[PDB]
Every structure is written in C-alpha cells, then in structure tokens.
Write a protein that binds this DNA or RNA. Structure first.
Ligand SMILES: Cc1cc2c(cc1C)N(C[C@H](O)[C@H](O)[C@H](O)COP(=O)(O)OP(=O)(O)OC[C@H]1O[C@@H](n3cnc4c(N)ncnc43)[C@H](O)[C@@H]1O)c1[nH]c(=O)[nH]c(=O)c1N2
Length: 459
DNA sequence: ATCGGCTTCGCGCA
DNA sequence: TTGCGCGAAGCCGA
C-alpha cells in the first residue's frame, strides 16, 4: 500500500466489475509509476486484471519528427516491458474525450485511473471523459515527488516561498517504490503508427541545404532503459561537478535527463532517491536537488494555478507595469520569427545557441535563459516575444510542450518567480543578461565555435 | 510586525 | 579565467 494523498477522485461512482484501466499520458514508463502501482493495487483488490491504454492525439503535428520518433520508440519499448509482466497495452488514435470514453465502455472497465498534468488540455479531456463514463475515475500524481495539490494551494510567488514548503514534506513522500506485481489473472499497430506519422511530418523536416536533416538523433537514445544509464552516468561522472559547471555550456556537465522526465520515461522521484544516497559534493547535491525538486515542481505549481500560463496576463503585476511602460521604446534590432528560427541575428552567440537547439534538440540550460531574454529585446512587443519563444521552444526542444518550458519562458521574459532589477529601455526591470556577462563565465568563443559552420550549411 | 533575503544579473577591481 | 562587494529593485513572510 502506498501513500493515499497521491490520489484525487475525479469522478465518484460505483466500482465496475471489469478490469482496471490505466490511461497513460504523462508518465510513459513501467517502473517507478505511482499511477501504475496504484491501478495494479485496485485491480488486485477487485481481483481483476489491470491494463494500460494510451491515446495518440493529432498533437504530434504541432512539433517535429524528433519528438515523435523519441516518444514512439519509447512506447515500442514500454509495450514489451508491460507484456513481460502480463499487462496488456492498448493504443488509441484520436481525441481522448471520445476514444477513452469508448474504450471504457467497449472493454467494460470497472475503474479509470490517469496520471497528473497541469496543461489546460488534460483538464479539458478529463472533463469530457467524466461526462461519458459512469465508473469511478482516479487521478494520481506520478510525476512530482510531492503531489502538486499538496505542496501548496496557491500560486507560489518565488522559489524561496515554495522551498520551505516542499522540504517540510519530503520525509513523507520521498520513499522507495514497491515492485510492480505482474497480473495473476489473464485478460480475456505501433509500427504502422510510427511510419504513418513520419510520412506526415516529413515535408516539415528541418533540412540543411543538401537536404539531409538538421537533427542529430544520437545524443539521446529514447526509452526507459536508455534513461537509467543517463541517470547512472550522471551520478558517477557529472554530479560531482554540477554545482561548479552547471553554467558553462562548453562543458557537458548537465544531467541530460530532461527529454526523459518530460515523456515520463524516468521518475524524478527515482533520481532524487539515487542522488540522495550518492556521496558527492554537498554543494552539488544542493544545486542539483533544487533544480529537480524546487524548480521542476514549482513549474507544475505555476501551470496548475494560472490557466493563462502561456500568456502575458500571467506575469507579475510589477512585471506588466514595467513592460507596458517600455512598449513605445525604440528597439536596437527587430527580427521576425523566421530570422530567429534560422539563426539569422547579429549576435553570433545567440545564433550559436539556436544552432544547438536545431541540431541537437536540447539547448544548454544557461544559454536558454540568455536565448529568451534576447528575444524580448529584439522583438517588436512583449506578446510577440512570448509567442516567438514558445513557438521555437515547443517546436525544437525534445523536452518542449512542458510546464518547465512555460514556467522558464515566463521567468525569462516576464520575471515570474523572480524579482525586479535595474530599469532598462525596452526590457524594463526584467533581469538583464549580457554577452560580456557570458564572457566572465565561460569561453564563448568555443561555444560559438562548435555550432559555427552550420548556419552557413542550413537554409 | 518592519525589514531581511531573494536562481546564481552585470560589472569593476584585484 | 575567478571571487567579492556593490548597485537597482518589488515584495513575501515571518
Ligand atoms: C527559456 C527557457 C526555456 C525552457 C527552460 C528554461 C528556460 C529559461 N526549461 C528549464 C531548463 O532549461 C531545462 O529543464 C534544462 O535545461 C533541462 O536540461 P537538463 O535536464 O540537462 O538540466 P539540469 O540537469 O541542469 O536540470 C535538472 C532538472 O531540473 C529541472 N530544471 C532545471 N532548470 C529548470 C528551470 N529553470 N525551470 C524548470 N525546471 C528546471 C528539469 O526538470 C531538469 O531536468 C525547460 N525545461 C524543460 O524540461 N523543457 C523545456 O521545454 C524548457 N524550456
């Protein structure tokens, strides 16, 4: 039995007599899954089978092959891991509000379970689902270490107000995962799906002049197994010097975990457990935990309590006041979406970062902050900057379309979870970042040098 | 309370 | 490079 405040009753009803169906969505993995572990639990009590259903919405069209290969290949692996433990996996195509409801009837599901996501479109779908089912319907936070609706009931103004809260709750929720018990009872194509999708997304590929792709797909092998190794090599090779090199992009000293945590291919709670027991720097473990605990989960807190998380209106009062005061200011440059996208600005280090984004699908965490603040400076308005920053983040980051994306863009452009700094023209009081500031931190000429000879080779 | 502390910004200066 | 003190800055929360 697991901690019962990880569950929240979406719909009450009378328990069916069919199997218990887990509607996977955020947490695409079989280990370390409070949503899967809970569903198994209530099917063993009901003495019924547990099964997984996954829905494949048209959303893969609003991004690239890169994200879809990465996630489809992952699911190809999960489906096998699940049938190992005797748990069937069903793959729906279409709109959840309709297809999940149909499945719930067509298999005679006795209880519905899902994982937790704060993006508006899950609440939309869930709310259709509730309407068309009669069975009970459960939702489990399987993504955060502390259930979002439990760490805080309000928008948290800053990391230092969240932090005493989150940490006062870890002795309760930071625990080991039990074993996923195979099915005892035995209930009664993703190859085409992955081909069909790439023939669709192929006319939109990001190509170089010579028509081979920009994207390089060997930096991150998708899937649960590949993720475990990225966690272990992190703990053994990179964790010890994270604190002191987090900010250098010429070093590859990050965890590189974010494509995995986004597709739920690995549990942040598992990471935390392995980091905690590891014996590296106390400084570095502090650095690291605060990014995967405080910053990650306050990003869910943000989107969960501010339905306008991808818009201007969600900036803090002072932020908007300041930015409106400077809408009339003359911008040093202005660039269009296309120009940013193609890395055609005056700033070679900015374009360098953009080139890291296009070719690899994961931009360095420090360069990300620089990236968005310089979009605000050379956009024609704050709204356009947001719109540009979201469109390029979500289109090219393997970890895009994610609460961290919005809560990081908002931190960057609109000062959300941050404070006021010295007033500038165009960018108001938003924390400024400078090219020369980057030079006191790392060897910009190497970072630039790495992605040079790719703007020329692309168009 | 009223007032200390804040993702770790940039920049001078040693 | 690297570290320190400083400056400009709105406000939570204890
Ligand atoms: C403009 C902009 C845009 C984005 C983001 C930040 C900024 C300023 N982020 C957040 C952060 O840049 C990103 O999570 C890390 O670079 C992920 O790479 P690593 O896992 O290697 O980092 P690293 O190992 O240093 O970080 C560990 C984990 O902490 C979390 N994290 C780190 N910094 C964070 C931040 N500022 N906000 C929220 N979570 C943070 C992530 O969960 C990350 O996996 C984001 N993240 C993401 O997952 N998807 C995205 O699309 C974006 N987009």
């Amino acid at each position: 039995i697991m901690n019962p405040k990880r569950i929240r009753a979406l719909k009450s009803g009378k328990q069916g007599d069919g199997p218990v169906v887990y509607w996977m969505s955020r947490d695409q993995r079989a280990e370390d899954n409070w949503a899967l572990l809970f569903s198994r639990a209530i099917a063993k009590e009901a003495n019924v089978p547990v099964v997984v259903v996954f829905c494949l919405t048209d959303e893969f069209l609003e991004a690239g092959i890169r994200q879809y290969e990465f996630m489809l290949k992952g699911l190809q692996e999960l489906e096998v891991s699940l049938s190992r433990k005797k748990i069937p996996s069903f793959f729906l195509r279409g709109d959840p509000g309709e297809k999940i409801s149909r499945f719930v009837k067509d298999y005679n599901a006795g209880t519905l379970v899902t994982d937790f996501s704060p993006l508006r479109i899950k609440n939309q779908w869930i709310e259709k689902v509730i309407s068309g089912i009669s069975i009970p319907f459960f939702e489990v936070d399987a993504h955060n270490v502390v259930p979002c609706w439990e760490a805080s009931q309000k928008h948290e103004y800053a990391a230092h107000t969240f932090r005493p809260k989150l940490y006062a709750l870890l002795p309760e929720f930071l625990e080991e995962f039990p074993e996923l018990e195979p099915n005892s009872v035995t209930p009664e194509t993703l190859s085409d799906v992955l081909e069909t999708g790439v023939k669709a997304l192929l006319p939109e590929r990001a190509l170089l002049k010579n028509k081979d792709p920009l994207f390089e797909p060997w930096h991150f092998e998708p899937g649960e197994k590949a993720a475990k190794k990225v966690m272990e090599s992190f703990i053994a090779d990179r964790l010890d010097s994270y604190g002191a090199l987090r900010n250098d992009p010429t070093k590859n000293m990050l965890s590189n975990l974010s494509p995995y945590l986004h597709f739920g291919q690995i549990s942040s709670q598992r990471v935390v457990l392995e980091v905690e027991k590891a014996e590296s720097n106390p400084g570095s473990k502090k650095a690291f935990l605060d990014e995967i605990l405080i910053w990650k989960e306050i990003s869910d807190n943000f989107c969960y309590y501010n339905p306008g998380y991808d818009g201007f209106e969600s900036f803090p009062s002072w932020a908007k006041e300041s930015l409106n005061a400077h809408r009339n200011d003359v911008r040093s440059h202005i660039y269009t979406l296309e120009e940013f996208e193609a890395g055609k600005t005056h700033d070679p280090l900015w374009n360098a970062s953009q080139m890291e984004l296009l070719s690899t699908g994961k931009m360095h965490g420090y360069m990300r902050m620089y990236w968005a603040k310089k979009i605000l400076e050379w956009s024609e308005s704050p709204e356009k900057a947001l719109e540009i920053a979201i469109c390029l983040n979500d289109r090219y980051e393997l970890d895009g379309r994610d609460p961290n994306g919005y809560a990081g863009i908002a931190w960057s452009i609109g000062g959300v979870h941050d404070r006021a700094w010295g007033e500038r023209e165009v960018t108001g009081k938003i924390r400024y970042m400078s090219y020369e500031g980057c030079k006191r931190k790392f060897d910009v000429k190497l970072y630039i040098e790495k992605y040079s000879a790719l703007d020329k080779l692309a168009a």
